[PDB]
Amino acid sequence: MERYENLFAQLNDRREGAFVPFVTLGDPGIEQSLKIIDTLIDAGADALELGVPFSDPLADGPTIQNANLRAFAAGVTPAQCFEMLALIREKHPTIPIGLLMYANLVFNNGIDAFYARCEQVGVDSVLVADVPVEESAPFRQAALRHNIAPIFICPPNADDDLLRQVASYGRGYTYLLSRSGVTGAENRGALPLHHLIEKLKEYHAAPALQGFGISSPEQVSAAVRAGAAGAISGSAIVKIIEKNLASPKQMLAELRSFVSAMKAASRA
Amino acid sequence: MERYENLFAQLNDRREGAFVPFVTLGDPGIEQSLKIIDTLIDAGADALELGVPFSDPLADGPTIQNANLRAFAAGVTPAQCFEMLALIREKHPTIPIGLLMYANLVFNNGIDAFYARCEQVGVDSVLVADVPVEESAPFRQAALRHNIAPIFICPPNADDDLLRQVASYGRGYTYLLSRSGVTGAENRGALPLHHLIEKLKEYHAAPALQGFGISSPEQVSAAVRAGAAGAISGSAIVKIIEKNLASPKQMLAELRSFVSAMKAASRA
Amino acid sequence: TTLLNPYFGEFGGMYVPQILMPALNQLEEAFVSAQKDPEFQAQFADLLKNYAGRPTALTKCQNITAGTRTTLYLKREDLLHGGAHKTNQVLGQALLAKRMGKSEIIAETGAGQHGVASALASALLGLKCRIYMGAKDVERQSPNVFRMRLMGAEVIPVHSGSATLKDACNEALRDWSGSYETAHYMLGTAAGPHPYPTIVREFQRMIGEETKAQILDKEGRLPDAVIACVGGGSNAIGMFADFINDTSVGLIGVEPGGHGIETGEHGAPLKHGRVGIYFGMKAPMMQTADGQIEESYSISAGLDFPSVGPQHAYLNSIGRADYVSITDDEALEAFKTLCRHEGIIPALESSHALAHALKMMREQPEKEQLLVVNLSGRGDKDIFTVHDILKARGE
Amino acid sequence: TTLLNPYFGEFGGMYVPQILMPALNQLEEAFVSAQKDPEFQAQFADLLKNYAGRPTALTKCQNITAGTRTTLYLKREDLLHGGAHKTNQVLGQALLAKRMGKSEIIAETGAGQHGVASALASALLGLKCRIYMGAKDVERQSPNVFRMRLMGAEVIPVHSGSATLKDACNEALRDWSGSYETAHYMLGTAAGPHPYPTIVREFQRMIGEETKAQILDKEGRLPDAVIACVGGGSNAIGMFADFINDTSVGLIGVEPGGHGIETGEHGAPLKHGRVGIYFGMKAPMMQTADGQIEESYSISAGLDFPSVGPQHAYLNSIGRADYVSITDDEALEAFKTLCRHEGIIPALESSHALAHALKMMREQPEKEQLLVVNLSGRGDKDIFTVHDILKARGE
C-alpha cells in the first residue's frame, strides 16, 4: 500500500505537517489501549507509532519502560499485538501505522515471517530501534518484499555517507532524531537541524518526522517551520496514561485535549 | 635468715613433708586476704607462696588470672602487698614466705631495690616465673645480696645441665614442676619424677616442692612418697575463695578443712 | 564499514541504535591505532607490571589432585591488583579513553570486580567514574560496593528487571547513548557490540600468553586443557586466545548451571539458549518462545547473565572449544575444597571452573591429564554469601 | 646457651617460663640448620614465587606527590597472597614446623592478616591451625575471621584484658607452654623471645632486598628513606634489614599515635614507653608507674600493641633508625588519599606509614627526596570500619 505517500501528499496539499503519537500496544490493557488509540485518531493523529512490548527496550527511558511493564502485567504478547493491529486497521483503513520494534522480536522466529505478519494485518512501516543501517540488509529486504516501509534514523551528527544510505534504504518516512539519549518527555531535543532536513530532501529521502523529547505544541510548530514533514511524541502521551490509570474517562479526555493541541501546532 | 632451712630440718626430724598453699595477696580484698592467710597458717600450712597481682600473668590459668583481677578490683598494688607482708611477718616470725613474681614487677624500678624491699619486710624467697636460669644472673645476685632465696624451676624434661644449674643457683627450695602448661586445679600433673628428685639430691639442690595441678590429699601423699620435700597447691585453694565471695565465714571454714586435709596427707 | 571483522562466523555485529555507531567506529579506530603504537604498548605494559602486579603466578595444586593422574595448575588472576582478571583490560580501555579525549567512564558491574577495576583505573588516570550495579548484586557482593565508593566512583543501584548484571548492562548502554560525547563506556566483558569482544580479548590475552610460557617452563609441554568460567566471556577468552592455534590444547568453558539446567534457573545460553539479538550483539541467549529476554540465575553475580560473548559462540560452533555447566552446589563444594586444601579463597565465579576440573579428575582418576584452571578472582567479595549458605545448610 | 645472639644491645632475650626453653632452643637449631640447607631454601623460594606471588611490585605514585619534589614508591606487599606481608614469614615458619616434626600450629592475630596467613599455610602444608584473636578485633577485622574459618582454622576469641592483640598473644603463649610437644607457636611479628625476632626478620628480609633491586633499576640509586609502620616490627624490619649497612638510607618507623600521644591512648612504646620485661622479651613497653602493662590503643588492630620488637629498640638507641607516630585521623586521611588518587585501598596499619611519608612531603614540599613506603597490606579488612567512621563523621 501507499499509506504514508498518500498522507504526505494530502498534508502537502493542505500545507500542513503531521502529528504522530506513540503508545505501547496493550498499555494499560488490551481494551483500554484500543480505546486510547481510537481517541488519538479521533483527536487528530495523522499516523501512529505503536510499540510492541519488549523485555529490554534499550532506546527507551523510564516513561516508556513503564508502559512496556504495564502491558506485560496485563499479559500482552506480540501475538495479541497483531490481533490488536488487525482490529485497528479494520476500523481505520487509511491511517499509516508504524511499529516500534526491537531486533530480537523481529529476528525471533524468522525475519521474513515477521514482516509477512505485518503485511497481513496492514502495518505500513517498521522501525527496528537497535538495528543500524550497517546491519539492516535482511530487515530492509524482508520489509520491501512484504510492502512494508523500513524506517531508518538520521541522528544529529549524521555524516554525508549516512545521509545517503538513509535516503536510499528507507521508505515511508525518515526518522529525524532530536537529540542523543533515550526516549523521554523531560529531556527536550534541539530545534530540527535545517542542514539535515535540507540534505535529506536533496537526496530524495522519505519525508522527515522529528522525534525524541517532543512534548509541547511549540516544539511541533518549530519542527514543521524548520522544514520537517511532522513530529512524533511518545513519553508526553504515555505520561497521560500513567497519570490517569484509576480514571479512564479522564485519561481519554486529557489525551484528546493534548493530541488536539499538538495537531493544531502542526499547521504552523 | 634461714627460715626454709629451719623448716626443712624440723620436717625431716618429724619425718614429714611440707604443705605450701598459694594465694594472691589482696584477693578478694586486703582485710579478707589477711584473714585468709591467717586461716591457712592456723590450719597447718608449713610455708606460704604469695602472688603479687600482675596485669599479664602468663604462667597462670583462669583461676589465678581471676584472683589477680579480684585483687585489682580491690585496688591492690605492689606497695600494698609489701604492707601486707610486713603485717604477716610481724604475726608469724618463723613461717617461710615466698613471693610469686613476674619479671616486670621486679625489674620495674630496679632489681636491687625490689629484693631490698623483700628483705625489709622479711620475705624468704622470690620465684620469678618468666625468668629462666639462662636470664637469671642479675636476679639471683640481687636476691643473695639481700638474703633472699632465688627459686628456680625443674621442669619434667629437665636435662642434666639444667639440673646442675638449678641445684647451684637456687636456694631455699627447688620447684619441681608437675607438668607442662599453666597453673590450674583441673589439669592434674603426673606423679613426681623420681629420677629428677634423686638427681637434685645428688647435686645437693635445695629440697624439692612439687607444684602445678596439686589439688587433692592423694597427690600430696604421692609427692612425699616419691621423695619430694612437699607440695604446693594454688588453684584448689583459690577456687574456695572464688566460690565463697558472698559467704566469708563459710570461705574460711572451707579453707581450714581443705588445708588441714592437705597437710595431713604430707605426713604419709 | 569497519577496519576489523565485527563477526565470529554468524555471531557478533553492532546491533545498537544508529546514534552510537560513530562512538563504536571511533573506539575501533583508536584501538587499531593504539595496537600499533609503541608508546601506548609501553604505557600499558608498565601499568600491568608495576601497578597491577603482572605476571601472575601459576600455582601447582599440592593436595587436591592426590591419588589421581591429574596435574592441576591454577593461573592466579586472584593475585592481580583489585582481586580479579578484570583489572587487565580496564587499564587498556582507560588508556584508550584518554587517547580519545574522554574524561568520564561508565561501567556496568555484577560481581563488583569490574566496577572495582573501573574505579581504581579512573582514580589512577584521572577519570570520573560511574558504575551501574543491579540492586540484588549490591547486596550479595557488598564488599565491592564499599571498595568502589572509597575510590570515589559513583555506584548507581539498578532495581529494574532482575536487578542483576543484565539490568546494569541495560542502564549503562542507555546512559552512554546520551553521554558518549564526554563518556567512554568501559564494557567489562567480551560481549556487546563490536569492537568490544575484540578489544577485551586483546587486552586479556596476556593471561594465556603467560600461562603458556609458565607451563612450558614447569612441564616442558602444553596443557591437555585450559578451563575457565564464562559469564560474558572475558577471562575465558583471555586464557584461550593464545592457545587457539595449538590444536592439541583443549579449551573448556564453564557456564553457570544455577539450581540445575532442568529448573530453568541458570545462566547457560551457549548450550541451553538460542541465537538472538540483544545488548548490541547477535549471540546465544536465554529467551522466551516469543523472543523476550529471560532472566538468568546463578549463585555467582559475575556469571548471572542470559547471554555470552560471540567469539565463544563461534568457537563452540566449530568444535574448537567445548562448553559445560556447573551448578551452584558444585561451585560451593569447589570453593570449600580450595580454601581447605590449598589455602586459596577463590571467587565463586572461578569456583565454577575449578569444580569442572575437579569433576574431570574425579570421573576418570587414572586418566593422565595436565590441566590449567583460570582462577579469575579471589573470593573476599563472596565470604559473607558463602558463610550464610553453609550456616543455613547446618554446617 | 644459644647458637645466635638473643640480644640487640640491651634489648631482647628469652624471658619465658623455664618449661619453654627447650622449645626455643629447638626452634633456633632448626632455623640455623634450615638457613644452610639448599633444599629448604629452594622449597621456601618456590612457595614465595609460585604460591604467594613474589616478587611484589614497586609502584611509583603518579598523583599524590604532584607539585612537590618528593618521588614516592610503594612496595606492594598488599599484592601478596593473603593480602599482607605476613604471608612471607609464615611460609618459612610452617616449613620449620614440619622440619621439627610438628603437626599443629598456634598463632595470635590482631588485624587477622597473620591469622589468615597462618590458616592458608596450614591448609597448604597439612597442619592443624588454631588462632587466638581479641574479641574487639574479631569485630573490627571481621572479614578476616570469615577467611580464617573458611580455610579450616579454629578461631578462638579472647575476652580478657583489652580483648586486642596483647591478649591474643598472652593466650597463645599460655597454650604453647602446655602444647609445645606437638604444636609450633607461629609468632607473627618480630618480637617475643629469641629466636623469633631474628627468624621473623630473616624470613621478611626479601621485602627490602627486592625494594633495593627495584629502586636501583628504576632510579639508579638507593632511596633517601624507607618508611614502614611498626606494631611488633615485622614489616618494618623486613624492609629495613637489607638497608641497615647502607648508611645514607634513612630508616623511619611509624608507631600508632592513636587519639594522640598526650591522651595516653596510643601504641607508641618505643618513643613514649620505657624498658620492661613482657611477652618473652626485654623491650620498651607502655606500663604504669608500678610496672603493670598498660593497654594500648590504635584504630588499627595490627598496631594496637603496647610493646615493640627488640631490634627496633636497638636501632633507635644507636640512632640508625628514627621512629615517629601518626594518629588515627592522620592514618584515615592517608587511607582516603591513596584510595581516591592512586586507586589502591591500603590496610589502616600501612596507612600510618603512608601518612608519615605524606607529611614529609607536605612539610617540606621543595625538598628533593626519594622515598619508599612499605605498603604492608590491603585494606579490604578495614572497609567496614572506615565506612562507619566517615559516615558518623558526616561524610
Ligand SMILES: O=P(O)(O)OCCNS(=O)(=O)c1ccc(OC(F)(F)F)cc1
Ligand atoms: O517522545 P519521546 O521522547 O518518548 O520519543 C518517543 C519515540 N518513540 S518512537 O517509537 O518514535 C522511537 C523511535 C526510535 C527509537 O530508537 C531509535 F532511535 F534508536 F531507533 C525509539 C523509539
Ligand SMILES: O=P(O)(O)OCCNS(=O)(=O)c1ccc(OC(F)(F)F)cc1
Ligand atoms: O596449684 P596450681 O596448679 O594453681 O599451681 C599453683 C602454683 N603457684 S606458684 O606460686 O607455685 C607458681 C610457681 C611457678 C609458676 O610459673 C613458673 F613455673 F613458670 F615459674 C607459676 C606459679
Ligand SMILES: C=C(/N=C/c1c(COP(=O)(O)O)cnc(C)c1O)C(=O)O
Ligand atoms: C560481571 C563481573 N564479574 C565477572 C567475573 C567473571 C565472569 O566474567 P567473564 O566471563 O567476563 O570473565 C569471572 N570471574 C570473576 C572474578 C568475575 O568477577 C563484574 O565484576 O562486573
Ligand SMILES: C=C(/N=C/c1c(COP(=O)(O)O)cnc(C)c1O)C(=O)O
Ligand atoms: C598483628 C597483625 N597485623 C599487623 C600488621 C602490621 C603491623 O605488624 P608488624 O609491625 O609486625 O609488621 C602491619 N601491616 C599489616 C597489614 C598488618 O596486618 C595480624 O594480622 O595479626
Ligand SMILES: [Cl-]
Ligand atoms: Cl519473530
Ligand SMILES: [Cl-]
Ligand atoms: Cl514502500
Ligand SMILES: [Cl-]
Ligand atoms: Cl620494681
Ligand SMILES: [Cl-]
Ligand atoms: Cl640463702
Ligand SMILES: [Cl-]
Ligand atoms: Cl551520532
Ligand SMILES: [Cl-]
Ligand atoms: Cl548521567
Ligand SMILES: [Cl-]
Ligand atoms: Cl553525549
Ligand SMILES: [Cl-]
Ligand atoms: Cl586434549
Ligand SMILES: [Cl-]
Ligand atoms: Cl621442658
Ligand SMILES: [Cl-]
Ligand atoms: Cl588446647
Ligand SMILES: [Cl-]
Ligand atoms: Cl606439650
Ligand SMILES: [Cl-]
Ligand atoms: Cl637520607
